[PDB]
Amino acid sequence: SSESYETIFSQRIIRDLQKELVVGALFEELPMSSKILTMLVEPDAGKATWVAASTYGTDTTTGEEVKGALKEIHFSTYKLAAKSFITDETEEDAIFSLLPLLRKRLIEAHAVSIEEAFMTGDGSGKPKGLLTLASEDSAKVVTEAKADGSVLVTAKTISKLRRKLGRHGLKLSKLVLIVSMDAYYDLLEDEEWQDVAQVGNDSVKLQGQVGRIYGLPVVVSEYFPAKANSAEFAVIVYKDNFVMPRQRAVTVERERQAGKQRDAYYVTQRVNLQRYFANGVVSGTYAAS
Amino acid sequence: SSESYETIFSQRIIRDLQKELVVGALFEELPMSSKILTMLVEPDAGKATWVAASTYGTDTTTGEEVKGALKEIHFSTYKLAAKSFITDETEEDAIFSLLPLLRKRLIEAHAVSIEEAFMTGDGSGKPKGLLTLASEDSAKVVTEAKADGSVLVTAKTISKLRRKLGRHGLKLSKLVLIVSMDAYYDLLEDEEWQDVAQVGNDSVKLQGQVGRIYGLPVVVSEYFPAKANSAEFAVIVYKDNFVMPRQRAVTVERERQAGKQRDAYYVTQRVNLQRYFANGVVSGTYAAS
Amino acid sequence: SSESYETIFSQRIIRDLQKELVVGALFEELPMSSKILTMLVEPDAGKATWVAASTYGTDTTTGEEVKGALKEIHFSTYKLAAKSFITDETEEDAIFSLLPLLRKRLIEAHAVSIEEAFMTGDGSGKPKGLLTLASEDSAKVVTEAKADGSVLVTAKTISKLRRKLGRHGLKLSKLVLIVSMDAYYDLLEDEEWQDVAQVGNDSVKLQGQVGRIYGLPVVVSEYFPAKANSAEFAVIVYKDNFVMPRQRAVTVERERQAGKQRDAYYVTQRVNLQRYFANGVVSGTYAAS
Amino acid sequence: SSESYETIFSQRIIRDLQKELVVGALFEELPMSSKILTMLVEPDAGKATWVAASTYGTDTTTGEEVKGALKEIHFSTYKLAAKSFITDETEEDAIFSLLPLLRKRLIEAHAVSIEEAFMTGDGSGKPKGLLTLASEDSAKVVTEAKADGSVLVTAKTISKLRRKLGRHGLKLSKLVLIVSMDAYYDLLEDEEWQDVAQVGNDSVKLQGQVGRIYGLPVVVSEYFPAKANSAEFAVIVYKDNFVMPRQRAVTVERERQAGKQRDAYYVTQRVNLQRYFANGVVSGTYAAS
């Protein structure tokens, strides 16, 4: 068995085993099944639930009241997908060892670029991605940090960030933060360490990553491209905004020629990303100015 | 058609299986069946149970003597419904495995709403809430920590109110304590810190809640409003104070029509959770003042 | 029905779990067959029971020698019971779950006042009370403390009294300590720890009690009357000085009336507190005089 | 006859026990098989696939995106060994078995040289010391520890080193570092211990090599050169590149006699190491600057 049925199910074993690279794929693994997944619920927005039934239980105010709502809420995927160019006609030179040692390799780049597009993706070919999203959220809190000019890397920006989002977003459950390593090195390697920047392990016995800010643990890995202009952050509630539609099977369809001794290698699971709301994150900013 | 009667024992059973929030969502639970479980009893208030009964015995002060007692020990219930359909009308091009995909979220909305109604609450339709309890208990004598910033994150507060309720009840079974996240970091991974909440299991040993301050496990659960003023404690013994007359085994009310682009699955719950005695809970305190 | 032999069992097992109040009594609880138990021996309050019996057989001083200890070794326990009564009218509603969840409080507050008697009681109706028996041994010898005006004794008195029944009490196996909670606040949270007070956990090892001096587990409070004139300490070797004859395994009888539709139960108990010899606890004073 | 056809197979098990030298050979065995081991493939430059390819899946920069890449996968260890001998005329003291005294330090010195060569190797015959490998890349990046003249041994140094690393590297997952005891001697006996270096063990639990910088079980050992210039650290992830290619199992080569009272136990070795790519570790400097 070669490019057939042998380094296949361990590929998905890796692919769940690499859920483990998570610049923010800790998100709500919606396990999709058919396709046009489409609930038409009302949001978890605005309530305030029942008067538990008697006479006129707040019968003057209000009713329904805000949104609410009915978004509605349709989802599917992008049939997300991978492929492994190598030399395959000469693969029968009796090794079977080499090749799983040649394996793993590409689940890495697979999931990494997957998360890259998952935070930097246009809803197009790949689904949606944070920095597009937070950009099209108009979330450039312009510009409370100032684009490498003046290293104002405290938390006041993050403070009114949290207190902008605190309607919708909750308080510190979980509420998260994906910065730049430059922003890291601006908010770690300092005395500030506010509430926490150091160390954000610190105990540990809880889940997340390097760094904690104000209770929010911190993520880096820089898909803002560097210096001055993007967000430098991703201050978002890790609950009230975003789930992860994955559908079902990745499959390692290792087909044949495909010539030049480089024969057909293909991997493929429909996954996606959606939320239920308006914004998760106001961040940066720190932009062109 | 589904969503009328096909998955319900499902929902009640998984609601049993995450009735599981170690904050109040288990307590002194009475799986009730009356509408109002009423009695007129006189528990541990007044007596002086046996006394010597041979010579003199109860002849001067005071007769009743003080409380007492009476309440009366009624136990109504509180109606904890939800009301989230989805439109099954044309969202039906073979879905059905959405029934193993849709649900789940809804009792999560239930139990979060349940707890936040549970700890702060008015008795009107909810029970009267435990953080509000300490407010109407005034169990909340200030100050013992200075109001978000240079907060004396001690435990002599704890010890003082500990024997104060040990004037009420006794000591160290259970005695419990619900904290803020502000009190989470403010008394986890500070120095000393305090009595004991290093480690934070703190053994773990017991039946289960994170932390153990001489027997007081540490509940964040994050519903204290910060802003310098609230408690950041909840000094109570559980195993004295407050029972849960928990009423009904839940039926959803997956009602069909409700037509014209919709359906109707109202959901339900009925419990009650009731003060057993007098003043058996303290909190904070710590406030802004 | 209920109020019956069927429900004494969940009304009598409460004794088994809360005879266990570690607040004032721990002895070899004698299991009694007869009632007015008595031995006729003279215990070893003078013996010395061989020289070898040798070439001499101790003929001169003295002729008995002293007491003795022919008391003679009597026992005669004490009936102890609250009257129990439930709403013996209203429930024909088969609640039952009720009288579990209603009481376990009668055995309890029964035991509460029982230990108020145990610490403090003139011998009739109760058996022996501690501070009343302490009020004959000159246990409250004058003085050690300074009448509620910054009282200064550490375990200084404890060393003195520790010598004073360093007499035929050895040290610290068992020999234990009860104090007051006023004594828990004038000494625990002192700096002392004079060998220990603070923190007195001090592992927490086997059974033990709250706080510890020198190894000795420590109880406080209530049943110690404060008012500066007291024993605010209670030191004794439990093992030598005092024991529990306990006769009546628990009977409560759930015969009915008792009229006015509320009927009759009775939390009968015959146990007894008894000792042997002479002065076996010295503790206080600690005066107001 | 011993040292003949027996202890070789014991030398097998000792070579399996001398897998265990927890300083170096904590990499990844490639157990090769023909002679040289080699797959055909060009290193897959650009993959980073993710088959979108919806429209022109990025049509600008670059178009490869990486020259080239062909390094490549073609590997062979060498004829590595330990010469060994004794005079076998003088273990004839009814022994036939002083190999419990004799070998081990054989196998010690074998692996001692081996991991020494991983500190101090040449790339041909021996593979490589990594300080060598530190040198070629100009990973010796200055100025950090000043020349052992006011040594600026900080982790801010290692922070800029991670500013290199944690891009293509991760953060402390897995990631490692090998020091000198002089290099540890600023991190032994200090308070610095920077964001985390504490301390050594500390929990203790996992691979816990001495020093725990941001959770790095740090190997000291050192067969570096010391004084002013070396690599005081080794900011790496072991799991980045860096596999052992190895060949066979054990072979000691026992041309026995060989007279002149000297044997020939040629304790071979057919293992190796190379990395896998380009940059893999920064360390130093810790120069004469």
Side-chain angles (χ1 to χ4, degrees), chain D residues 13-30:
Chain D
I13 343 186
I14 309 158
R15 274 252 39 84
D16 304 358
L17 165 58
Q18 222 351 282
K19 307 162 163 38
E20 294 81 293
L21 201 70
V22 206
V23 7
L26 192 44
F27 297 96
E28 6 289 338
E29 270 226 343
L30 170 64

PDB file of all heavy atoms in Angstrom, chain D residues 13-30:
ATOM      1  N   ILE D  13      22.589  -4.442  25.172  1.00  0.00           N
ATOM      2  CA  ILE D  13      21.611  -3.958  26.135  1.00  0.00           C
ATOM      3  C   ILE D  13      22.155  -2.736  26.832  1.00  0.00           C
ATOM      4  O   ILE D  13      21.411  -1.835  27.221  1.00  0.00           O
ATOM      5  CB  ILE D  13      21.234  -5.048  27.150  1.00  0.00           C
ATOM      6  CG1 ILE D  13      21.642  -6.423  26.654  1.00  0.00           C
ATOM      7  CG2 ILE D  13      19.754  -5.011  27.387  1.00  0.00           C
ATOM      8  CD1 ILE D  13      21.189  -7.549  27.525  1.00  0.00           C
ATOM      9  N   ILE D  14      23.471  -2.669  26.957  1.00  0.00           N
ATOM     10  CA  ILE D  14      24.077  -1.502  27.572  1.00  0.00           C
ATOM     11  C   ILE D  14      24.041  -0.321  26.611  1.00  0.00           C
ATOM     12  O   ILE D  14      23.914   0.840  27.018  1.00  0.00           O
ATOM     13  CB  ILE D  14      25.497  -1.846  28.038  1.00  0.00           C
ATOM     14  CG1 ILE D  14      25.447  -3.124  28.878  1.00  0.00           C
ATOM     15  CG2 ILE D  14      26.010  -0.755  28.927  1.00  0.00           C
ATOM     16  CD1 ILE D  14      26.765  -3.876  28.962  1.00  0.00           C
ATOM     17  N   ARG D  15      24.089  -0.602  25.321  1.00  0.00           N
ATOM     18  CA  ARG D  15      23.914   0.462  24.365  1.00  0.00           C
ATOM     19  C   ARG D  15      22.482   0.929  24.333  1.00  0.00           C
ATOM     20  O   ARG D  15      22.196   2.073  23.979  1.00  0.00           O
ATOM     21  CB  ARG D  15      24.354  -0.018  23.000  1.00  0.00           C
ATOM     22  CG  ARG D  15      25.822   0.172  22.820  1.00  0.00           C
ATOM     23  CD  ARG D  15      26.094   1.284  21.853  1.00  0.00           C
ATOM     24  NE  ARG D  15      25.153   2.368  22.042  1.00  0.00           N
ATOM     25  CZ  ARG D  15      25.302   3.326  22.939  1.00  0.00           C
ATOM     26  NH1 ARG D  15      26.365   3.365  23.719  1.00  0.00           N
ATOM     27  NH2 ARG D  15      24.377   4.245  23.038  1.00  0.00           N
ATOM     28  N   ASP D  16      21.568   0.047  24.679  1.00  0.00           N
ATOM     29  CA  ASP D  16      20.195   0.470  24.877  1.00  0.00           C
ATOM     30  C   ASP D  16      20.038   1.238  26.165  1.00  0.00           C
ATOM     31  O   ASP D  16      19.142   2.069  26.288  1.00  0.00           O
ATOM     32  CB  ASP D  16      19.296  -0.743  24.869  1.00  0.00           C
ATOM     33  CG  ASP D  16      19.460  -1.530  23.631  1.00  0.00           C
ATOM     34  OD1 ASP D  16      20.255  -1.080  22.776  1.00  0.00           O
ATOM     35  OD2 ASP D  16      18.813  -2.586  23.507  1.00  0.00           O
ATOM     36  N   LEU D  17      20.845   0.914  27.157  1.00  0.00           N
ATOM     37  CA  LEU D  17      20.909   1.730  28.348  1.00  0.00           C
ATOM     38  C   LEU D  17      21.729   2.956  28.072  1.00  0.00           C
ATOM     39  O   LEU D  17      21.500   4.015  28.655  1.00  0.00           O
ATOM     40  CB  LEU D  17      21.496   0.929  29.503  1.00  0.00           C
ATOM     41  CG  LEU D  17      21.993   1.611  30.780  1.00  0.00           C
ATOM     42  CD1 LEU D  17      20.911   2.424  31.456  1.00  0.00           C
ATOM     43  CD2 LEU D  17      22.526   0.561  31.737  1.00  0.00           C
ATOM     44  N   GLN D  18      22.663   2.863  27.154  1.00  0.00           N
ATOM     45  CA  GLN D  18      23.212   4.124  26.757  1.00  0.00           C
ATOM     46  C   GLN D  18      22.548   4.675  25.547  1.00  0.00           C
ATOM     47  O   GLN D  18      23.202   5.318  24.727  1.00  0.00           O
ATOM     48  CB  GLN D  18      24.711   4.077  26.577  1.00  0.00           C
ATOM     49  CG  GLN D  18      25.344   5.343  27.190  1.00  0.00           C
ATOM     50  CD  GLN D  18      24.341   6.458  27.639  1.00  0.00           C
ATOM     51  OE1 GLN D  18      23.802   7.229  26.835  1.00  0.00           O
ATOM     52  NE2 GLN D  18      24.130   6.540  28.934  1.00  0.00           N
ATOM     53  N   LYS D  19      21.259   4.459  25.418  1.00  0.00           N
ATOM     54  CA  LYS D  19      20.479   5.584  24.969  1.00  0.00           C
ATOM     55  C   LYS D  19      20.473   6.659  26.048  1.00  0.00           C
ATOM     56  O   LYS D  19      20.576   7.850  25.736  1.00  0.00           O
ATOM     57  CB  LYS D  19      19.085   5.102  24.593  1.00  0.00           C
ATOM     58  CG  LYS D  19      19.193   3.945  23.607  1.00  0.00           C
ATOM     59  CD  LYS D  19      17.932   3.138  23.513  1.00  0.00           C
ATOM     60  CE  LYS D  19      17.921   2.274  22.264  1.00  0.00           C
ATOM     61  NZ  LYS D  19      19.245   1.690  21.937  1.00  0.00           N
ATOM     62  N   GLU D  20      20.467   6.251  27.314  1.00  0.00           N
ATOM     63  CA  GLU D  20      20.234   7.189  28.400  1.00  0.00           C
ATOM     64  C   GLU D  20      21.430   8.045  28.722  1.00  0.00           C
ATOM     65  O   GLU D  20      22.167   7.719  29.654  1.00  0.00           O
ATOM     66  CB  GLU D  20      19.813   6.469  29.675  1.00  0.00           C
ATOM     67  CG  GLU D  20      18.485   5.771  29.599  1.00  0.00           C
ATOM     68  CD  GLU D  20      18.552   4.425  28.915  1.00  0.00           C
ATOM     69  OE1 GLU D  20      18.809   4.398  27.702  1.00  0.00           O
ATOM     70  OE2 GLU D  20      18.395   3.395  29.591  1.00  0.00           O
ATOM     71  N   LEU D  21      21.648   9.120  27.991  1.00  0.00           N
ATOM     72  CA  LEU D  21      22.428  10.173  28.598  1.00  0.00           C
ATOM     73  C   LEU D  21      21.732  11.499  28.382  1.00  0.00           C
ATOM     74  O   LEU D  21      21.903  12.114  27.328  1.00  0.00           O
ATOM     75  CB  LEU D  21      23.829  10.207  28.044  1.00  0.00           C
ATOM     76  CG  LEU D  21      24.607  10.956  29.104  1.00  0.00           C
ATOM     77  CD1 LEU D  21      24.732  10.112  30.352  1.00  0.00           C
ATOM     78  CD2 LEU D  21      25.946  11.374  28.587  1.00  0.00           C
ATOM     79  N   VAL D  22      20.958  11.954  29.377  1.00  0.00           N
ATOM     80  CA  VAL D  22      19.980  13.040  29.226  1.00  0.00           C
ATOM     81  C   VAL D  22      20.672  14.395  29.081  1.00  0.00           C
ATOM     82  O   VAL D  22      20.505  15.297  29.912  1.00  0.00           O
ATOM     83  CB  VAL D  22      18.974  13.064  30.403  1.00  0.00           C
ATOM     84  CG1 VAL D  22      17.623  13.702  29.987  1.00  0.00           C
ATOM     85  CG2 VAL D  22      18.728  11.659  30.955  1.00  0.00           C
ATOM     86  N   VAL D  23      21.483  14.537  28.032  1.00  0.00           N
ATOM     87  CA  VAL D  23      22.059  15.826  27.715  1.00  0.00           C
ATOM     88  C   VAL D  23      21.894  16.118  26.228  1.00  0.00           C
ATOM     89  O   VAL D  23      21.595  17.254  25.844  1.00  0.00           O
ATOM     90  CB  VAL D  23      23.529  15.907  28.209  1.00  0.00           C
ATOM     91  CG1 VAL D  23      24.063  14.572  28.745  1.00  0.00           C
ATOM     92  CG2 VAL D  23      24.454  16.454  27.158  1.00  0.00           C
ATOM     93  N   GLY D  24      21.995  15.098  25.387  1.00  0.00           N
ATOM     94  CA  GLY D  24      22.063  15.329  23.965  1.00  0.00           C
ATOM     95  C   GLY D  24      21.125  14.480  23.146  1.00  0.00           C
ATOM     96  O   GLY D  24      20.221  15.018  22.505  1.00  0.00           O
ATOM     97  N   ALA D  25      21.257  13.152  23.216  1.00  0.00           N
ATOM     98  CA  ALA D  25      20.623  12.227  22.269  1.00  0.00           C
ATOM     99  C   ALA D  25      19.127  12.082  22.532  1.00  0.00           C
ATOM    100  O   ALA D  25      18.570  10.984  22.560  1.00  0.00           O
ATOM    101  CB  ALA D  25      21.302  10.870  22.332  1.00  0.00           C
ATOM    102  N   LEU D  26      18.456  13.227  22.685  1.00  0.00           N
ATOM    103  CA  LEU D  26      17.052  13.364  23.022  1.00  0.00           C
ATOM    104  C   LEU D  26      16.404  13.854  21.732  1.00  0.00           C
ATOM    105  O   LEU D  26      15.370  14.523  21.690  1.00  0.00           O
ATOM    106  CB  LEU D  26      16.841  14.317  24.199  1.00  0.00           C
ATOM    107  CG  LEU D  26      15.508  14.448  24.944  1.00  0.00           C
ATOM    108  CD1 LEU D  26      14.903  13.085  25.230  1.00  0.00           C
ATOM    109  CD2 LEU D  26      15.675  15.235  26.245  1.00  0.00           C
ATOM    110  N   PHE D  27      17.042  13.504  20.638  1.00  0.00           N
ATOM    111  CA  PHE D  27      16.452  13.820  19.362  1.00  0.00           C
ATOM    112  C   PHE D  27      15.686  12.637  18.812  1.00  0.00           C
ATOM    113  O   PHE D  27      14.977  11.953  19.552  1.00  0.00           O
ATOM    114  CB  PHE D  27      17.509  14.248  18.379  1.00  0.00           C
ATOM    115  CG  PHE D  27      18.206  15.481  18.766  1.00  0.00           C
ATOM    116  CD1 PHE D  27      19.408  15.422  19.437  1.00  0.00           C
ATOM    117  CD2 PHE D  27      17.675  16.707  18.446  1.00  0.00           C
ATOM    118  CE1 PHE D  27      20.077  16.574  19.772  1.00  0.00           C
ATOM    119  CE2 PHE D  27      18.343  17.860  18.778  1.00  0.00           C
ATOM    120  CZ  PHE D  27      19.552  17.791  19.420  1.00  0.00           C
ATOM    121  N   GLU D  28      15.803  12.411  17.505  1.00  0.00           N
ATOM    122  CA  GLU D  28      14.838  11.612  16.765  1.00  0.00           C
ATOM    123  C   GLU D  28      15.576  10.634  15.859  1.00  0.00           C
ATOM    124  O   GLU D  28      16.251  11.047  14.913  1.00  0.00           O
ATOM    125  CB  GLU D  28      13.887  12.515  15.965  1.00  0.00           C
ATOM    126  CG  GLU D  28      14.178  14.055  15.945  1.00  0.00           C
ATOM    127  CD  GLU D  28      13.932  14.820  17.253  1.00  0.00           C
ATOM    128  OE1 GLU D  28      13.159  14.347  18.113  1.00  0.00           O
ATOM    129  OE2 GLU D  28      14.603  15.846  17.468  1.00  0.00           O
ATOM    130  N   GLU D  29      15.455   9.343  16.160  1.00  0.00           N
ATOM    131  CA  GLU D  29      16.184   8.328  15.413  1.00  0.00           C
ATOM    132  C   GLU D  29      15.579   8.125  14.039  1.00  0.00           C
ATOM    133  O   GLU D  29      14.382   7.898  13.881  1.00  0.00           O
ATOM    134  CB  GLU D  29      16.202   6.983  16.148  1.00  0.00           C
ATOM    135  CG  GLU D  29      17.390   6.763  17.109  1.00  0.00           C
ATOM    136  CD  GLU D  29      18.065   5.393  16.966  1.00  0.00           C
ATOM    137  OE1 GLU D  29      17.459   4.481  16.363  1.00  0.00           O
ATOM    138  OE2 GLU D  29      19.212   5.228  17.446  1.00  0.00           O
ATOM    139  N   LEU D  30      16.437   8.202  13.031  1.00  0.00           N
ATOM    140  CA  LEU D  30      16.114   7.673  11.718  1.00  0.00           C
ATOM    141  C   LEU D  30      16.956   6.425  11.571  1.00  0.00           C
ATOM    142  O   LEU D  30      18.179   6.513  11.418  1.00  0.00           O
ATOM    143  CB  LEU D  30      16.406   8.689  10.628  1.00  0.00           C
ATOM    144  CG  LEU D  30      16.293   8.038   9.274  1.00  0.00           C
ATOM    145  CD1 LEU D  30      14.859   7.582   9.053  1.00  0.00           C
ATOM    146  CD2 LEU D  30      16.736   9.038   8.244  1.00  0.00           C
TER     147      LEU D  30
END
